RNA sequence: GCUUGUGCUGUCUUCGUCCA
């Protein structure tokens, strides 16, 4: 599903179909993010039910996101080049 | 519902804040320190701790679990490590920016060469945009070549003359006009010295330069500690049945770590300055070509085969890069492709689908009291007969593969379960031909299951697709949800696309032998007898049963 | 370049930053699939033909409405209030003719894409209400005048009571109101189309409903549609022209291949 | 092992000419040795010492085995070639030209 | 600009509706000066870094965004596409709430 | 699970010493700071509650809920059993027992008089609400005892602590 | 596991009478048999088969 | 110490409950999910004031799943211990390593290393107790202790007290 | 604050095509997940057809929140928007 | 008494198919 097909689906106005194509029919992934630093550095043990961002030293302000696996890979490669992409779930102003 | 339960609330991303990573943050988010170049412990499995494939960095194996989060390969995202460098080095992407900042400030007392007393400087301060603010401040302070001990009343200036800094390779040279003519000396500006100078810059001066005290600090452009990506970023491959080859990034990190140990041992034992310079330039070259191997004006880092090293930068650019190749467009599931054929006996919004393609593709239908009997009939039919089904999905998400189930005839369906039934008649599907020049290249059709291995189209839709039947192929996409089916059937359907907004005229018409025949049949001297008239009238689906006089 | 441009619920066209690109999409706020070529009847012709077609004089007996087309033909001559209404209609038509001929279309072109096909609506009304036969019409002239005048103030492109909103709304429907007034003229309705009361009310309601249905929908990604609509002809295609000239225009090249001036001289 | 069948192989690990083959069926049986696990704790005849490296037929193809070749390579190890034969009848969607 | 584009399009007999070229030249002249449809025109805007990097000069744009501590508000379609979210366009330009008042009936 | 009305608090670089919870230093953290915000965003003060005030509030709320659930038609056990959840029932039973066995003021009017004395007093206009709650809860008898148990009151020597304690003992039912 | 998997079989009834095949899938009575000449696999009930043995063709019941 | 706090909860409702009784069902679900819970950030939530008149607002339909998400804001009474605070307690169990007390729902453990030496544990006593010449502390005896450390769990709080300072011990 | 009072609503009173598609999809999904139906179904079984029947009779219990570019919004009931 | 096994490389190069 190339870029031109994406533009055609934008021109149709079908946002739900585009989201389903690019996530459910492809690399859908779930990550946890700290609510303070906004980094994907949470250490989650789901069956032990314990979450922790060791850097920010917090256990309660943690969320889960559904993002493409390629987006996760891109953010990790950016982090490898010392760039800090921080994902926040609220606006500031 | 394909992910195991987590008590963390589910939210979406509203803002992305960019910035640089501080050494404190790199040390804090790390789970282990990488200091051993050897990948394998003793060539007897169980990779060495503190190495580039430490088991705390994450698990990329089916039977092994991550020692940091305890999750399996499917769920573990990978964890970062760090690698302390013996000497600081430049980040290859920020060297011109470091040069411009060095021009902007004073190399001895870390202060801007000009203050707000100059009205032009105040105007340069006023602009909110950090890039333009930095550009203006740089355009001003570049001219100023001497720190002012007193106000042009002491501004804290040390009075020293500002050198001329020129870039060559990754090395900056600061030419001081030491005290008409004299003998000027150009001395190397080592990364440690610039780092120390940047570290003394006040927060307010940092803000004046367009940097941010919290996220983007000027001394963080110098690498003192290197984050180590998890194995998920740099997976190993299986070249043959036995030997497995390491990724390019792993080899480059091994080279960096060897150079670091070399620098450290050399400094500790005995220090001829020339040898220090050689080995430290080797370390700088390795760190620079680990991130950018397309540096102009110097040779590329090569593999043992002679092919150049694949750097991180080259993973993100081009058609096959991360952005264009895996985010703006990707390969998707639930799709089909085959040759297309014409069918005069199909409706305008119908598509003929081969039986094998209908058996392969599926739609997950929710079991309700309106369809439970039909769905259990489909489940009894099985994955090899049409109309059948391929999977039964429980509420908890466990799939039941109907191929390898010995009691598929004894499966009882509960409300709320999902059945992945075969593609059936009148299911909306998206149909597409490349290149997709306009929005009429993707339209939603209705499925009709037919024999033989081609897709079948009404001939009036061949114009918007720009298709013919001399070998062309077209793609088909199956929606997987009720909302997505409604979107396809109410927005992208073929009848809704008859008139195009480009020229406010139709894009579909009568073509080919239908056009020739309608010209021939409507000539003034064409007459038809009663029996043929009855046949032609019965051929009309919308005919009301009344024969005209 | 155009991917993030969308029509919003206030009618404006904006990008992802909220910067306004157009205060109304297409300067008329209409969808590109809802317009057809129609002729504006006040633009062409001579002054004699325009006067003969549109002027109704209730004093002179040979330049009035025909007596076999209206049942009230007797008590019509000599009225002054009705003559004032007819004069107001004619002055509005003359103003429309001046406006179109002097500001909008100066070369006399009068076949332009507009919404709501009026000819189709009129012939549909004629077919539905059986407007054939020489039967006189019961449609009074003030009814025609007030119906057309009220119709020309219910074509809502923008909603609101602010004065700027009203000015923009009046601006957006100028050409369409000119078309409607040129077609639904009193003499034309009474003689050429021969509508009655029921047909007239049906035509007014149909015009209003169809104009409401021709507006662009908020949420449209008109930028991508414009990009595809411009790039599609480029696929199928001494002054440089074609694809190199399109490249020169889109790149804003400083040195074009064939610079040229178009110099116009004074009349003499 | 793979999901395909192995009953069409002979003692020498090679299929014989004249046998019907469907997709994924195994036509060449090959194994490579592997250092045994702690299964010497006691597994009389069921301790794994080999890993399967067999060659399956292409999933989209089927036909008849036409000829099986056995020889030795330049180095000196065994070397096999299996040829499959099938008939293709024209149908809807096949390309022709003058 | 509209006259030149119309000349180029209409020379070979083709026809394009006015609103498309009007939107194009309005984007090309909205900033007070001529903005070319190139990286020098498009990528010198105030849009988000993620939206600009996906066109051209990806790594340079990301390095500049990191050094400048840019904040992407994720309002464009490209950011939501590459984050796997419902883009604020078409059917995603509004929200759907549950009408408790009507449900009483 | 439940989220406070205070949000944001993003990453920075400075570290402060007024971050650890400490009753003696009167550092109650951000979520229990002296300044709070309601659902309307208006200014709001931290609301401490003594055992008398807490007992009155829990009894009032529980009896209101019990009356509402019964169609608008005193025992602690039945009132605890009104609530749902076995662990919730155990928690409310433990709180009811703790409050009952340490109730300094079981009367509404006595609690009202205590609250008015501890609020409208000029000396108490500077006292932190946590200090007020601790004084009304622990039932101290001596200034030295109160200072030892509550170190924050040592720095506030402009408070007529002894007479306030004697008034509290007088109001306390023997 | 059925004793008829990967065994040569002959069809005795229906539209494919007298065609030699091999049993590939056998779950509940609907044996999947590939046909030697037509490159296809067809479903068939166990009643319509004839399993080869060392002494001629045997019916399904008389073999299991 | 007890406090009044303005709390919020996110409640997700399945479409099968989209009926006229949606508001009351959400209220009872909120009560069952809030009353008696223990969150380390806040402490212990004991009761919710005005529990039958809580505004729930309008729920937002989650795209792709149909279920509505509700934001419910409420005021509740919350109790949380603090480091360095002196509170009363009741001894619940006696052990050689120390004694376990109960402060409402919270259980506080005090080790012998934080107990004065004269309060020697007597296991022969009926019931077993930590007794001195003039003091005798056993099960059910009123004790005044000072909270020194607090341990936070996923949905539990563990506190550690001490009685080695003045104005502590038996009361 | 961001909410706009019902008397001064200035957006179009007609249901757009995107809103119609999204409302039909959401209602069909809810019906397929066992939500109560507010219209009498004669013999209809398909959730989308039932949703369309509900829409034609103005019985869909959903609210559309239309967002303005500045951040404010208007709330419109599905029963007070004109549908063609 | 006897029970059926559960998956796949990477990187280049060349030749092709349908549009343009
Ligand atoms: Mg072709
Ligand atoms: Zn964090
Ligand atoms: Zn892990
Ligand atoms: Zn200086």
Short mmCIF file of C-alpha atoms in Angstrom, two decimals, chain B residues 355-489:
data_model
loop_
_atom_site.label_atom_id
_atom_site.label_comp_id
_atom_site.label_asym_id
_atom_site.label_seq_id
_atom_site.Cartn_x
_atom_site.Cartn_y
_atom_site.Cartn_z
CA UNK B 355 -13.03 -19.21 -5.66
CA UNK B 356 -9.46 -19.83 -4.45
CA UNK B 357 -9.02 -16.14 -3.59
CA UNK B 358 -12.37 -16.16 -1.78
CA UNK B 359 -11.22 -19.19 0.23
CA UNK B 360 -7.89 -17.55 1.09
CA UNK B 361 -9.29 -14.18 2.16
CA UNK B 362 -11.54 -13.86 5.19
CA UNK B 363 -13.71 -11.41 7.11
CA UNK B 364 -14.18 -11.69 10.91
CA UNK B 365 -17.92 -11.64 11.59
CA UNK B 366 -19.26 -11.21 15.12
CA UNK B 367 -21.65 -13.92 16.30
CA UNK B 368 -25.09 -12.49 17.12
CA UNK B 369 -28.58 -13.91 17.38
CA UNK B 370 -29.30 -12.68 13.84
CA UNK B 371 -26.60 -14.84 12.23
CA UNK B 372 -25.65 -17.71 14.59
CA UNK B 373 -27.24 -20.45 12.45
CA UNK B 374 -25.57 -19.26 9.23
CA UNK B 375 -22.22 -18.89 11.00
CA UNK B 376 -22.33 -22.36 12.54
CA UNK B 377 -23.25 -23.75 9.10
CA UNK B 378 -20.12 -22.01 7.77
CA UNK B 379 -18.09 -23.51 10.64
CA UNK B 380 -19.40 -27.00 9.80
CA UNK B 381 -18.41 -26.51 6.14
CA UNK B 382 -14.79 -25.87 7.10
CA UNK B 383 -11.82 -24.12 5.49
CA UNK B 384 -11.82 -26.15 2.26
CA UNK B 385 -15.43 -25.74 1.08
CA UNK B 386 -17.10 -22.53 -0.03
CA UNK B 387 -19.00 -21.10 1.81
CA UNK B 388 -16.89 -21.96 4.87
CA UNK B 389 -14.72 -20.46 7.59
CA UNK B 390 -11.12 -20.59 8.75
CA UNK B 391 -11.00 -19.52 12.41
CA UNK B 392 -13.14 -19.12 15.50
CA UNK B 393 -11.98 -16.36 17.85
CA UNK B 394 -12.90 -16.48 21.52
CA UNK B 395 -13.68 -13.38 23.57
CA UNK B 396 -10.27 -13.68 25.26
CA UNK B 397 -8.69 -13.71 21.78
CA UNK B 398 -7.67 -17.37 21.43
CA UNK B 399 -7.89 -18.53 17.82
CA UNK B 400 -9.26 -21.96 16.90
CA UNK B 401 -7.65 -23.17 13.68
CA UNK B 402 -10.37 -25.16 11.90
CA UNK B 403 -7.77 -26.96 9.76
CA UNK B 404 -6.24 -28.84 12.71
CA UNK B 405 -9.41 -29.33 14.78
CA UNK B 406 -10.65 -32.91 15.04
CA UNK B 407 -14.05 -31.87 16.49
CA UNK B 408 -14.92 -28.85 14.33
CA UNK B 409 -18.41 -30.34 13.98
CA UNK B 410 -18.73 -30.17 17.78
CA UNK B 411 -17.83 -26.48 18.16
CA UNK B 412 -20.66 -24.42 19.67
CA UNK B 413 -20.64 -20.67 19.05
CA UNK B 414 -21.36 -18.10 21.76
CA UNK B 415 -22.57 -14.55 21.22
CA UNK B 416 -19.69 -12.10 20.99
CA UNK B 417 -17.26 -14.55 19.40
CA UNK B 418 -15.84 -13.91 15.93
CA UNK B 419 -15.87 -16.27 12.95
CA UNK B 420 -13.39 -15.66 10.12
CA UNK B 421 -15.66 -16.80 7.31
CA UNK B 422 -14.73 -16.90 3.64
CA UNK B 423 -15.34 -13.99 1.28
CA UNK B 424 -18.99 -14.05 0.20
CA UNK B 425 -21.25 -12.39 -2.35
CA UNK B 426 -21.95 -8.64 -1.91
CA UNK B 427 -19.05 -8.05 0.47
CA UNK B 428 -17.57 -4.59 -0.23
CA UNK B 429 -13.91 -4.69 -1.28
CA UNK B 430 -11.52 -2.00 -2.45
CA UNK B 431 -10.13 -2.44 -5.97
CA UNK B 432 -7.02 -0.72 -7.27
CA UNK B 433 -4.66 -0.43 -10.25
CA UNK B 434 -1.17 1.12 -10.15
CA UNK B 435 -0.22 3.91 -10.73
CA UNK B 436 -2.94 5.60 -8.63
CA UNK B 437 -3.02 9.02 -10.28
CA UNK B 438 -6.42 10.09 -8.94
CA UNK B 439 -9.04 8.95 -6.45
CA UNK B 440 -11.00 7.01 -9.09
CA UNK B 441 -8.10 4.54 -9.27
CA UNK B 442 -9.40 3.08 -5.98
CA UNK B 443 -13.11 2.27 -5.86
CA UNK B 444 -15.24 -0.07 -3.77
CA UNK B 445 -16.91 -2.96 -5.61
CA UNK B 446 -19.26 -5.77 -4.61
CA UNK B 447 -17.97 -9.35 -4.62
CA UNK B 448 -19.35 -12.06 -6.88
CA UNK B 449 -17.66 -15.44 -6.48
CA UNK B 450 -16.96 -17.00 -9.87
CA UNK B 451 -14.87 -19.78 -11.42
CA UNK B 452 -11.48 -19.37 -13.19
CA UNK B 453 -8.50 -17.36 -11.94
CA UNK B 454 -9.16 -13.82 -13.18
CA UNK B 455 -10.79 -10.73 -11.74
CA UNK B 456 -13.82 -9.61 -13.73
CA UNK B 457 -14.92 -6.04 -14.36
CA UNK B 458 -17.73 -4.29 -16.13
CA UNK B 459 -16.23 -2.64 -19.18
CA UNK B 460 -17.43 0.86 -18.29
CA UNK B 461 -15.09 1.02 -15.27
CA UNK B 462 -11.99 0.37 -17.38
CA UNK B 463 -11.69 4.08 -18.16
CA UNK B 464 -11.20 5.42 -14.57
CA UNK B 465 -8.78 2.55 -13.87
CA UNK B 466 -7.08 3.08 -17.29
CA UNK B 467 -7.05 -0.69 -17.66
CA UNK B 468 -7.30 -3.16 -20.53
CA UNK B 469 -7.31 -6.95 -20.74
CA UNK B 470 -3.98 -7.62 -22.48
CA UNK B 471 -2.11 -8.72 -19.35
CA UNK B 472 -2.90 -6.05 -16.72
CA UNK B 473 -3.18 -6.91 -13.04
CA UNK B 474 -5.13 -5.24 -10.26
CA UNK B 475 -5.14 -5.40 -6.47
CA UNK B 476 -7.96 -6.08 -4.04
CA UNK B 477 -8.22 -5.10 -0.37
CA UNK B 478 -10.65 -6.63 2.13
CA UNK B 479 -11.98 -4.50 5.01
CA UNK B 480 -11.85 -6.15 8.43
CA UNK B 481 -14.44 -4.21 10.45
CA UNK B 482 -18.03 -2.95 10.39
CA UNK B 483 -16.96 0.72 10.42
CA UNK B 484 -14.47 0.12 7.62
CA UNK B 485 -17.09 -1.73 5.54
CA UNK B 486 -19.52 1.16 6.04
CA UNK B 487 -16.83 3.65 4.99
CA UNK B 488 -16.15 1.66 1.81
CA UNK B 489 -19.83 1.20 0.96
#
